[PDB]
Design a protein around this ligand. Structure first.
Ligand SMILES: *Cc1cc2c(nc3c(=O)[nH]c(=O)nc-3n2C[C@H](O)[C@H](O)[C@H](O)COP(=O)(O)OP(=O)(O)OC[C@H]2O[C@@H](n3cnc4c(N)ncnc43)[C@H](O)[C@@H]2O)c(*)c1C
Ligand SMILES: *[C@@H]1O[C@H](CO)[C@@H](O[C@@H]2O[C@H](CO)[C@@H](O)[C@H](O)[C@H]2NC(C)=O)[C@H](O)[C@H]1NC(C)=O
Ligand SMILES: *[C@@H]1O[C@H](CO)[C@@H](O[C@@H]2O[C@H](CO)[C@@H](O)[C@H](O)[C@H]2NC(C)=O)[C@H](O)[C@H]1NC(C)=O
Ligand SMILES: *[C@@H]1O[C@H](CO)[C@@H](O)[C@H](O)[C@H]1NC(C)=O
Ligand SMILES: *[C@@H]1O[C@H](CO)[C@@H](O)[C@H](O)[C@H]1NC(C)=O
Ligand SMILES: *[C@@H]1O[C@H](CO)[C@@H](O)[C@H](O)[C@H]1NC(C)=O
Length: 473
């Protein structure tokens, strides 16, 4: 078709429709949502990215970058059939300056590879998610929370500059001192404004030791959930969690536990965690000291860490939702707990809920001031918890299944003003219509995002079904 001929004339490498590699390059992370691209560009340099974008614009098709392909909604494929997919995973080089400790990271680099290179070359790191196969592109442009985030912030907070290919093929560099409006927009909503062709990240010196631990929670009835969660949020909100401590609740039908990573040794951990244990009347278990990379591996749930193979094909079948909330009033705790015990525990699929200890007085995430970037959730009191709700099937996903997580989220949002909750596009939820998605993902920053979208991509070349809409001018 026209897009294929345009790419050929422009000397852009592609994955041909009738090739083995099409299957891999086109594949979703979420097997519930396959889409068939119009074509797949396979750039090895920024020039190819420019040429691919220009071809999309000239021919009249939509285009989307795909970095790691982990979008829960397959938005790296366009979120619908018939987009040019700019597959970035042949571009995964990571370079670390020995002097400034700034890393230059190609946009197809996955987190495991990044972590490995930074650590092996200079004992450096930046703050990012668990899951070594996750692409740096989608992850860092919309937040990126992990087991260093209470200590060191979101992946987006370590971005120091970026080179971007705009919808008309122009090149720009964005930083605090250059195209600062674009730099603001990128840092929370980056999928909407261009294709990032190179990232520069600051780093911190990796701690020599980290200690993983677990605290099993007796959340077997609604009363225990309410009381335990009520104590836990009160503790976090009141400054109970030290900067070195990074933690979450993981819940499923069969166990609930706190899981943490303490940036320090086991004895430091025991001392630091004692007050919470006394508050919750629980005990520590599975206390394990690690070197930095062993710490990453512990929560990676992956044999492969340093992943660079374009054959990468990890996938699951699922529905997922997210939330960001303040502390919850007890009546909301009660409804959420009732749903957990009476509904979630009886759902005959592999579901889980993660509640990250996200905000509060000591969190590096919510220390970032409210004007620093488009990412919306920076208030230390109002943005206390981050949630991932995940509903996985091993056969095909049942078409009536969505009511489960939808109902659970309603138990939260019913009792919270819209100013006290939002949602997180790194757990992209295609159940949300376009208007609602923009509002819940970006909240108070939507209006400015829409203005910058009109300035930078007025034709919506980078469209997907939950993309920011250009402001009307
Ligand atoms: C599958 C998976 C996802 C995880 C995992 N662990 C996470 C964690 O511990 N913390 C988190 O905060 N998030 C975790 N996630 C979710 C991922 O963070 C999100 O799914 C990311 O958005 C995925 O990034 P990526 O793998 O790059 O996904 P794509 O589908 O390729 O892109 C998503 C989105 O971003 C746009 N985009 C990609 N690349 C670019 C560039 N270079 N420039 C602009 N825009 C870009 C895409 O077009 C798309 O819209 C653990 C697991 C197992
Ligand atoms: C990533 O970095 C490697 C260097 O480590 C680049 O590899 C070189 O590629 C050129 C031409 O493609 C070869 O002539 C060299 O021999 C390669 N060097 C080595 C040491 O292998 C590679 O080009 C870079 N990849 C990207 C996408 O930019
Ligand atoms: C490519 O896109 C950019 C932004 O969409 C255009 O640059 C802008 O041009 C306007 C007026 O022409 C200026 O007022 C802005 O300040 C520019 N923005 C930036 C970021 O440079 C650029 O003109 C476009 N190029 C073409 C050929 O259309
Ligand atoms: C502590 O870290 C060092 C590397 O910094 C590592 O060699 C050692 O094994 C770690 N100790 C423990 C108990 O994990
Ligand atoms: C919840 O379980 C605890 C024991 O784990 C019990 O003491 C408590 O009474 C239970 N509450 C209700 C309402 O069943
Ligand atoms: C644990 O860390 C503390 C620093 O907080 C240090 O004083 C102590 O030496 C460490 N313990 C061991 C066994 O290294």
């Amino acid at each position: 078709a026209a897009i294929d001929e345009c790419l050929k004339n422009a000397k852009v490498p592609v994955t041909a429709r009738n090739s083995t590699e099409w299957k891999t390059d086109a594949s979703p992370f979420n097997d519930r949502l396959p889409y068939t691209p119009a074509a797949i560009a396979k750039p090895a340099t920024v020039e190819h990215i420019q040429a691919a974008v220009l071809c999309a614009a000239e021919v009249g098709v939509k285009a989307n970058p795909k970095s790691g392909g982990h979008s829960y909604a397959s938005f790296g494929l366009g979120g619908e059939d018939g987009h040019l997919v700019v597959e970035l995973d042949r571009m995964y080089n990571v370079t670390l300056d020995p002097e400034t400790h700034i890393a230059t990271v190609q946009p197809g680099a996955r987190l495991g590879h990044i972590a490995t290179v930074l650590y092996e070359e200079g004992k450096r790191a930046f703050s990012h998610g668990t899951c070594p196969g996750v692409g740096v592109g989608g992850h860092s442009l919309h937040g990126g929370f992990g087991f260093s985030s209470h200590s060191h912030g979101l992946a987006v907070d370590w971005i120091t500059s970026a080179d971007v290919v705009l919808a008309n093929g122009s090149l720009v560099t964005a930083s605090e001192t250059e195209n600062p409006d674009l730099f603001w927009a990128l840092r929370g909503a980056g999928s909407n404004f261009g294709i990032v062709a190179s990232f520069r990240f600051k780093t911190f010196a990796a701690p020599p030791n980290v200690t993983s631990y677990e605290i099993n929670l007796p959340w077997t009835n609604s009363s225990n959930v309410v009381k335990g969660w009520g104590a836990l949020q009160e503790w976090l909100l009141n400054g109970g969690m030290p900067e070195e401590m990074n933690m979450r609740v993981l819940g499923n039908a069969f166990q609930t536990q706190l899981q943490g990573l303490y940036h320090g040794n086991a004895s430091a951990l025991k001392t630091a965690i004692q007050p919470l244990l006394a508050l919750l009347d629980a005990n520590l278990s599975s206390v394990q000291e690690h070197d930095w990379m062993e710490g990453f591996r512990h929560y990676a749930y992956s044999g492969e860490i340093d992943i660079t193979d374009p054959g990468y094909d990890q996938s699951e079948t699922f529905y997922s939702k997210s939330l960001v909330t303040s502390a919850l009033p007890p009546d909301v705790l009660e409804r959420v707990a009732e749903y957990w015990i009476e509904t979630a525990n009886k759902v005959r699929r592999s579901w889980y809920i993660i509640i990250d200890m996200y905000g509060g007085p000591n969190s590096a995430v919510t220390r970032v001031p409210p004007g620093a970037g488009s990412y919306a959730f920076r208030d230390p009191e109002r943005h206390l918890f981050l949630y991932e709700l995940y509903d996985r099937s091993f056969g095909p996903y049942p078409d009536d299944g969505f009511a489960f997580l939808d109902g659970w989220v309603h138990a939260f949002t019913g009792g919270l003003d819209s100013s006290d909750w939002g949602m997180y596009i790194n757990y992209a939820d295609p159940g949300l219509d376009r208007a609602e998605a923009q509002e819940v993902y970006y909240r108070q920053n939507l209006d400015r995002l829409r203005r910058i979208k009109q300035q930078l991509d007025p034709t919506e070349l980078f469209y997907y079904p939950q993309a920011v809409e250009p402001a009307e001018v």
